């Protein structure tokens, strides 16, 4: 049920998504070990993910949450990096996409910093890097991130290092 629609680089929607991607890069405490050493990206393509069933699944849940939280879904746009991006765009997020050993328990993790999600594209801790060169800092291989609509509802605040 999923189709992917390419956005033109001239499209304001392309430009606003690119700007979120580039503007939320930061340096990481690992010196680049997981995600590589970089200050910016070369954006090759931005596609809209269209799936009616998955969208209706999302909006159904969004309304449940909203109704439990004074009509406030607390919806954000956040990044997700994963080896499973292909399954996600076809079948949706589920328990198979959870970070079992995450610091806030087994759930599905999202970041405001695109460079944080970049650390997970090749797996936890960057895995062994790109499949072709086994380089976590590969400047050649094409990477993919998701920019996702996420319903937070009432969110439990955890202060953390």
């Amino acid at each position: 049920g999923t189709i992917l629609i390419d956005l033109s680089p001239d499209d304001k929607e392309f430009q606003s998504v690119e700007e979120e991607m580039q503007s939320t890069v930061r340096e990481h405490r690992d010196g680049g070990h997981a995600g590589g050493i970089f200050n910016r990206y070369n954006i090759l393509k931005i596609q809209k993910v269209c799936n009616k069933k998955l969208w209706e699944r999302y909006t159904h849940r969004r309304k449940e949450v909203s109704e439990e939280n004074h009509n406030h879904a607390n919806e954000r746009m956040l990044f997700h990096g994963s080896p499973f991006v292909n399954a996600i765009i076809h079948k949706g997020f589920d328990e198979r996409h959870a970070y079992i050993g995450g610091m806030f328990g087994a759930g599905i993790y999202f970041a405001e910093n695109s460079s944080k999600s970049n650390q997970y594209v090749y797996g936890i801790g960057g895995g062994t890097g790109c499949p072709v060169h086994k380089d976590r800092s590969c400047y050649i291989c094409h990477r993919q991130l998701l920019f996702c609509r996420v319903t937070l509802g009432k969110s439990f605040l955890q202060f953390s290092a």
Binding site: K45, M77, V85, G92, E95, G107, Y139, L146, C148, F156
Partner: protein, 47 residues
């Protein structure tokens, strides 16, 4: 998959040491996220 803390729909991980880090978030139901954009990119080697 774990459950949200009772009375909550997600967890927010607020950075408490690295002043430049933005927040990270966790949901415990896959139906609470929709993958709206697929971005294909390369990281760029600093000059």
């Amino acid at each position: 998959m774990a459950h949200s803390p009772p009375g909550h729909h997600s967890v927010t991980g607020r950075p408490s040491v690295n002043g430049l880090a933005l927040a990270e978030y966790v949901i415990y139901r896959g139906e609470q996220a929709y993958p709206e954009y697929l971005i294909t990119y390369q990281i760029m080697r600093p000059e």
